[PDB]
């Protein structure tokens, strides 16, 4: 006959793509609002990366690359993972995907079989459930109270494990909470993964925007269970470039590569080479990051002081560039609250799809002047 | 527990990807062969496309693009479809995927539900079945005789339709045969699609590398059923860039866009703006194609002459850059035949996965002095 699939019909739109369009036609019509929806860093990607891309175009590095990505990058990848993380992977247990998304997607398609349960920790990033389910998974979620600073309690994460449980998904530095879990909790969870025998999917990516704490990887602890997902996007201001990467069990990272070969065929060649440089040129990249962090950090202190001065309540993030604000007095729920704020010319993303009810996700990853302006517009609404 | 899925385990490796690696350690050890495994044009991509890319880097066009691709490209896309094809789509009924592969993938994930049958005509391009099945489809295949020069006979394609039947997939100018189906057969096939009610998936792509015939699109005929898939790769020597596109029913084109948002998030920004230029700068592109065409046409004739002279049998392609050679006198089957040829230092791809048994796929998309040598090496094998 004709008609769409159950899976596609069944899937929810987007918390953030929504607020974006509904800016532009408010913003497209005179009304200038301030937009704190941001997932991307205001900074432009580094000149040596841009450079390297140019070098590739020139050399004619424009043909089909391997499904798992170019050797040079995989090789350089297995190295960042050791140097920076203590993971001890070889280039065969490394893969470069079309962004950290394609990694998370191709992962769940390789493990997840229908009815398999994936434990997920709320407040959580919008897409985990969508993609768990798209594969035929079953989201089994565990809350993380704000009083206990949004860091998982091992004991209860334990009492969510069932014989159908196939994966646990931990993300530190946290989006949308900004929390950064201590070593011995990643230690703890990594252990339940080994104990009950199921993968542990760690979405590291925000590792470098770390203001206060120490970033621990569980793949140091449970290497034959852990799947460590990272990407170029957030650290190197390379979101539009579309490059992410991962490492773990040789076998699953080839199930992944074969989905990749039939879905995208292989990431855009130019960008691979461009990434190779951000990775191999320590000294240059070491500085961009260094500049970006302290940068976001001052905005992080700006938002929070003005926010707290205003009366609004929020959890001081230690990493990433998000802040879940308590819309409690600005409205009675997080949706009418959201509109009230769009009315004060400031686009926020409702905590609804993150299971962060009665909260809205602020983003200081934009300008110093938008946090000053957005904080002024909040001020009047109150 | 732990282990891979029944979908990933179940998939077969790659016919072409195999021959490639197995060159390189034969190649990568003294032995130079002649590799007619080629899917890519030996020409490098046009300089105005390269420059447009540079122009984007410069302009800092490096942030997240929308899931369906940038507006400018969508609008420019909808035009190429009208102008060059007669399909009257609006940019909303247009989408830019991460290659023609991702389009074909995201498509079947949007229509195809488990047990749904997809008619596919053999000889056929390796990946169609692979990805019909990955989604939960059921390949139902129809043979096309070489005596009838590999063009489908609508009547028998008719008697393969069952109430399970959800899509038909035609690709002219054909994948490994090189055939280009007549106006009234695409007309015929497009008709059944409407009559019996089921989508028609047209994999046009090779439209521009046509030597003798006229490229007809069925979306002219059955616009509410057809899903027209094309891409930058083959025409503009842009394989490595990773960019493809499609058009059709506004509904399945955003079911598609919705998968895209969670699989790739969106194609590589730089390559979008690079493509926009190839699409809008007519005069420049109009010439590269013109050059490439006649180029491939001559190699197409060199190969055919020398092959015909040598005694070997083959079907005179009218489009694309493949030729399905009859390994009949080179060995008793198409796989031992394949090896006897790697012996004479010439890598071919066995017709086995294309359901082109007793045939082997040569590809004149390489040099005029590779056809010369490869033809020489065939000669010696006798
Ligand atoms: C925790 C997390 N994991 C992965 C990704 C995607 O990484 P990839 O390497 O695939 O690109 C993210 C990404 N992004 C944002 C999205 C977002 C928020 N506001 C936006 C405005 C415009 C465009 C995109 C926006 C997010 O965190 O919501 C994250 O965070
Ligand atoms: C008929 C047809 N449709 C789609 C594609 C894929 O196009 P996309 O825009 O996704 O890149 C193919 C093209 N080419 C090849 C497959 C092939 C050979 N060697 C390759 C290396 C890398 C990627 C793809 C390769 C083929 O016929 O062998 C086809 O043909």
UniProtKB/Swiss-Prot annotation, chains A, B:
Family: Belongs to the class-I pyridoxal-phosphate-dependent aminotransferase family.
Cystine connections: none
Signal sequence extent: none
Catalysis: reaction(s): L-aspartate + 2-oxoglutarate = oxaloacetate + L-glutamate; L-arogenate + oxaloacetate = prephenate + L-aspartate
GO biological process: amino acid metabolic process; biosynthetic process
GO molecular-function term, one example from the UniProt record: L-aspartate:2-oxoglutarate aminotransferase activity
Enzyme class: transferase
Keywords on record: Aminotransferase, Cytoplasm, Pyridoxal phosphate, Transferase
UniProt xrefs under InterPro entries: Aminotransferase_I/II_large, AspAT/PAT-like, NHTrfase_class1_PyrdxlP-BS, PyrdxlP-dep_Trfase, PyrdxlP-dep_Trfase_major, PyrdxlP-dep_Trfase_small
Subunit structure: Homodimer.
UniProt-annotated location(s): Cytoplasm
Residues carrying N6-(pyridoxal phosphate)lysine: 234
Function: Catalyzes the reversible conversion of aspartate and 2-oxoglutarate to glutamate and oxaloacetate. Can also transaminate prephenate in the presence of aspartate.
Main localisation: cytoplasm
GO CC terms of this entry: cytoplasm
Positions of L-aspartate binding: 39, 125, 175, 361
Keyword Metal-binding among UniProt keywords: no
UniProt source species: Thermus thermophilus (strain ATCC 27634 / DSM 579 / HB8)
Protein name per Swiss-Prot or TrEMBL: Aspartate/prephenate aminotransferase
EC number assigned by the record: 2.6.1.1, 2.6.1.78
Site label Important for prephenate aminotransferase activity, positions: 12
